[PDB]
């Protein structure tokens, strides 16, 4: 039994989810007028805070909370170390609602103890294609197509309770209050990902890794030398040789994205994403924001030939604190962001991703098996990890789909 999630407009079981045929809301339809205007009650030693995201010092406080209390691997070897410039980038996209950033502070000292954030996103989340088929088959098309239009919803992320406050039922309260602030602005759906199993995922994809610096990865125990490498004189030599990469990209035509590129990238990106059942729709401003290069944060390259952007790829940076080594403070990880290829094979576009990432000193390239990410796994030498990233909707009945039907990257 889930004493909190049992009370919420989400499907409660797998056998419920594997049964839903059409997209649509779970809940009673409500109105902003229905929604309490007062923040949810919390204990008197605490207060609600709305951090200002254009203030270095609020940003810093959130940074400090996540640096010390955000996601850890299960072995307590690594913890995410999202930088401050990263957090402002992710929390302040175009038309962000400050009010959707929810913080709990100790009244006395104003020590930050909990956080959750929401950001707007325009998401295509109607009935998946295979299920539109079975609908036509059955004369049920109009019902299946009812919620096809892109919805302006909320993207939830960065939920985090201080280590000292764990298992005190605080996280439900943060979620109820975030829900409140979002329902207040006439939004009734949310989307979120988590490494854990909650009721109830609509897709689930394995994690994948590609060693850029195998010596460090073994030293910090991110990676092991596989038994098959012992049959060699010099295990680390063979490993290193095995993952080596060219020093410069292979595609002539390749450079960083510039502002003048935005409409072409938007265009090639949307054509690509539109073939997925679940995926975002981006304005010019959203493409500028989520893809223009920003130092230490997001790195984006286009293939231009004949003054035409035929292809682009993007990645972003999240260091993890190495918790249990002493020699290395940090794992320097590149995450495959969005991309599109029209003129060249995808494995060929992404090789140049590895090449750049490695040349800029990243230790590893990470990804989930969404988009067409599966298409380059073997030839670029990615390995599956032990994670599962799960994708969820709040207040939205949706069929179980394959992770390769998802085109939403969550930071
Ligand atoms: C319309 C808009 C709607 C807006 C809202 C949309 C929904 C958003 C939903 C959230 C999307 C966030 C996506 C991300 O950011 S995922 C990243 C999550 N963050 C971390 O893992 C950081 C390290 N961990 C922690 O800070 C805490 O352990 C957290 C905060 C995760 C739980 O704190 P704590 O350990 O002190 O526990 P509790 O006693 O306070 O609370 C216990 C209840 O919490 C349920 N629980 C445990 N983990 C998660 C989890 N990751 N998502 C949702 N629920 C979770 C759990 O099943 C139990 O419920 P029930 O089993 O009793 O029913
Ligand atoms: C190096 C390292 N550092 N950390 C902190 C870990 C867990 C690893 N090892 S890992 O590489 O193998 C790995 C990686 Cl990168 C990531 C995730 C993961 C979990 C949750 C999540 N959501 C993303 C959206 N917001 C909510 C959280 N995304 C990703 C799990 C694994 Cl297990």
The string of DSSP letters for 311-331 reads: EEEEEEEEEEEESS-SS-SEE
Q: Identify the CA nearest to 398 among candidates 195, 213, 192.
A: 192
Spacing, Cα 383 to ligand 2 middle (Å): 15
Classify 236 as helix, strand or coil.
Answer: helix
Tell me the best of 27, 194, 320 to mutate to test the pocket of ligand 1, counting ligand atoms within 8 Å of each CB and taking the most: 194
Q: How far is residue 220's CA from residue 328's CA, in Å, rounded to a whole number?
A: 8
SS3 call for 166: coil
Determine the distance separating the centroid of ligand 1 and the alpha carbon of 4, expressed in angstroms.
10
117: tokens are 């954030």
Strand ranges for 86-195 from DSSP E: 101-106, 112-124, 151-161, 190-194
Task: Give the closest ligand to the alpha carbon of residue 384.
Answer: 2
161 forms beta bridges with 114
Contact residues of ligand 2, CB 6 A cut-off? 71-73, 78-80, 157, 193-195, 207, 320, 331, 333, 366, 385, 387, 389, 410
What token pair was written down for 165? 């406050």
Beta carbons within 8 Å of 325's beta carbon, 6+ residues apart: 219, 220, 221
Q: Using alpha carbons, select from 20, 275, 268 the residue that is nearest to residue 124.
A: 275
Find the largest Cα–Cα distance for the chain: 73
> Measuring CA to CA, how many Å separate 389 from each of 122, 203, 246, 269, 403?
21, 9, 31, 23, 9
Q: Residue 181 is encoded by which pair of tokens?
A: 């602030």
Check whether the bond before 52 is cis (ω within 30° of 0): no
Question: How many Cβ atoms are within 10 Å of 370's Cβ, its own excluded?
Answer: 24
For residue 311, what are the domain limits? 1-411
Is 174 tagged catalytic? no
CA proximity to 304, closest of 350, 356, 261? 261
Alpha carbon of 3 to ligand 1 centroid (Å): 13
83: nearest Cα among 105, 102, 60, 103: 60
User: Hunting for tokens 């060929």 — which residue is that?
Assistant: 348
**Using CA positions, which residue lies closest to atom 32 of ligand 2?**
387
Count of structural domains, the chain: 1
Q: Residue 303: enclosing H or E segment and its boundaries?
A: strand 298-305
Is position 161 annotated in a ligand binding site?
A: yes
Annotated binding residue 3: yes
CA-closest residue to ligand 2 atom 19: 195
CA of 385 to the centre of ligand 1 (A): 23
The answer to whether 48 is a known ligand-binding residue is no
Report how far apart, in Å, the C-alpha atoms of 353 and of each of 159, 187, 215 are.
30, 37, 20
Among 223, 201, 203, smallest CA distance to 213 is for: 223
Q: Cβ distance 122 to 280 under 8 Å?
A: yes
| Dihedral sign of CA atoms 343, 346, 348, 351 in order | positive
Nearest to 364 by CA among 388, 338, 331: 331
Specify the residue with its C-alpha closest to ligand 2, atom 8.
73
d(CA 89, CA 317): 12
Measured from the Cβ of residue 238, the count of other Cβ atoms closer than 10 Å reads: 15
Tell me, using a 6 A CB cutoff, whether residue 157 lines ligand 1: yes
User: What is the experimental resolution, given in Å to one decimal place?
Assistant: 2.4
Rg (CA), the chain: 22
193 is in an annotated binding site: yes
CA-to-CA dists, residue 339 to 6, 267, 273, angstroms: 38, 12, 10
Atom nearest to 410 CA in ligand 2: 24
Angstrom distance (rounded) from CA 304 to CA 261: 10
Q: Which H or E run includes 259?
A: none
d(CA 175, CA 115): 10
Token couple for 150: 């892109």
Ligand 2 mean position, distance from CA 263 (Å): 32
- Going from the C-alpha of 86 to that of each of 37, 89, 103, 315, the distances in angstroms are 32, 5, 18, 13
Technique that determined the structure: X-ray
Burial grade of 28 (CB within 10 A; 0-12, 13-18, 19 or more): exposed
Count CA atoms within 13 Å of residue 115 on its CB side: 27
Query: Which residues, in sequence order, are bridge partners of residue 353?
Result: none
Measured distance CA(10)–CA(399) in Å, rounded: 12
- The CATH number of residue 392's host domain is 3.40.630.170
Q: Which ligand is nearest to the CA of 188?
A: 1
The atom number, within ligand 2, closest to the CA of 73 reads 7
């Amino acid at each position: 039994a889930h004493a909190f999630w049992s009370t919420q407009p989400v499907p409660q079981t797998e056998d419920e989810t594997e049964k839903i045929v059409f997209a649509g809301p779970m809940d009673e339809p409500k109105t902003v007028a229905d929604i309490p205007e007062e923040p949810y009650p919390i204990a008197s030693t605490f207060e609600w805070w709305t951090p200002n995201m254009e203030a270095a010092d609020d940003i810093h406080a959130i940074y400090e909370l996540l640096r010390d209390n955000y996601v850890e691997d299960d072995d307590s070897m690594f913890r995410f170390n999202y930088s401050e410039e990263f957090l402002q980038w992710a929390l302040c996209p175009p038309n962000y609602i400050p009010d959707w950033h929810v913080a709990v502070r100790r009244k006395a000292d104003k020590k930050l103890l909990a956080f959750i954030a929401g950001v707007p996103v325009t998401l295509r989340m109607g009935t998946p294609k295979y299920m539109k088929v079975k609908a036509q088959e059955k004369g049920e098309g109009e019902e299946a197509a009812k919620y096809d239009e892109p919805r302006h919803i909320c993207e939830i992320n960065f939920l985090c309770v201080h280590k000292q406050l764990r298992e005190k039922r605080l996280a439900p309260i943060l979620i109820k209050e975030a829900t409140r602030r979002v329902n207040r602005t006439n939004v009734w759906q949310a989307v979120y990902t988590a490494g854990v199993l909650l009721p109830t995922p609509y897709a689930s994809g394995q994690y994948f890794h590609r060693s850029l610096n195998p010596e460090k990865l073994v030293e910090i125990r991110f990676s092991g030398i596989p038994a098959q490498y012992q049959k060699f004189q010099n295990p680390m030599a063979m490993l290193k040789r095995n993952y080596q990469l060219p020093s410069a990209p292979k595609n002539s035509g390749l450079r960083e994205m510039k502002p003048s590129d935005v409409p072409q990238v938007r265009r090639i990106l949307m054509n690509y994403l539109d073939s997925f059942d679940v995926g975002p729709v981006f304005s010019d401003a959203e493409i500028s924001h989520y893809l223009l290069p920003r130092d230490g944060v997001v790195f984006t390259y286009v293939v231009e030939n004949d003054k035409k952007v035929t292809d682009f790829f993007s990645f972003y940076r999240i260091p993890s604190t190495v918790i249990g080594n002493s020699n290395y403070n940090l794992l320097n990880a590149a995450y495959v962001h969005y991309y599109a290829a029209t003129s060249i094979p995808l494995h060929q576009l992404i090789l140049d991703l590895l090449i750049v990432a490695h040349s800029r000193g990243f230790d590893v390239c990470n990804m989930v098996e969404i988009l067409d990410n599966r298409s380059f796994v073997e030839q670029l030498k990615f390995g599956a990890g032990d994670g599962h990233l799960r994708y969820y909707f709040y207040n939205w009945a949706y069929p179980k789909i394959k992770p390769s039907q998802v085109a939403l990257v969550m930071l």
